[PDB]
From a paper:
Therefore, d-enantiomers of [I11L]cyO2 and [I11L]hD were chemically synthesized and used for quasi-racemic crystallization to determine structures of cyO2 and hyen D. The mirror-image symmetry of d-[I11L]cyO2 with l-cyO2 and d-[I11L]hD with l-hyen D was confirmed using circular dichroism (CD). The crystal structure of the quasi-racemate of wild-type cyO2 was solved in space group P1 21 1 at 1.17 Å resolution. The structure of cyO2 displays a small α-helix centered in loop 3 and a triple-strand β-sheet located in loops 4, 5, and 6. The inset of Figure 3b shows the disulfide connectivity of cyO2 is well defined by the electron density and confirms it forms the cystine knot topology, the structure of which is key to the ultrastability of cyclotides. Overall, the structure of cyO2 determined here using crystallography is similar to the solution structure previously determined by NMR spectroscopy, validating the quasi-racemic crystallography approach for structure elucidation of bracelet cyclotides. To gain more insight into the differences between bracelet and Möbius cyclotides and why they might have different folding yields, the crystal structures of cyO2 and kB1 were compared. Between the two peptides, the hydrogen bond network exhibited differences. Specifically, kB1 has more hydrogen bonds between different loops. We note, in particular, the hydrogen bond between Val-10 (loop 2) and Trp-23 (loop 5), for which an equivalent hydrogen bond to connect loop 2 to 5 is not present in cyO2.
Numbering used by the authors:
A (entry chain A), B (entry chain B): 1 to 30
Write the structure that this text describes.
Amino acid sequence: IPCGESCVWIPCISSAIGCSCKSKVCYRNG
Amino acid sequence: XXXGXXXXXXXXXXXXXGXXXXXXXXXXXG
């Protein structure tokens, strides 16, 4: 699930809620 | 959790499946 953040320029700040960079977009659980 | 990247100036490399890092990203258990 996309978390509302991309990660081309900079890693995912949404890592704080468990999201991570996949294919340019921050996701958790698809 | 984590698992997207991070490092804070190196580190990571996925931990070869095992995660790593901490404050600066990585993941694993968390």
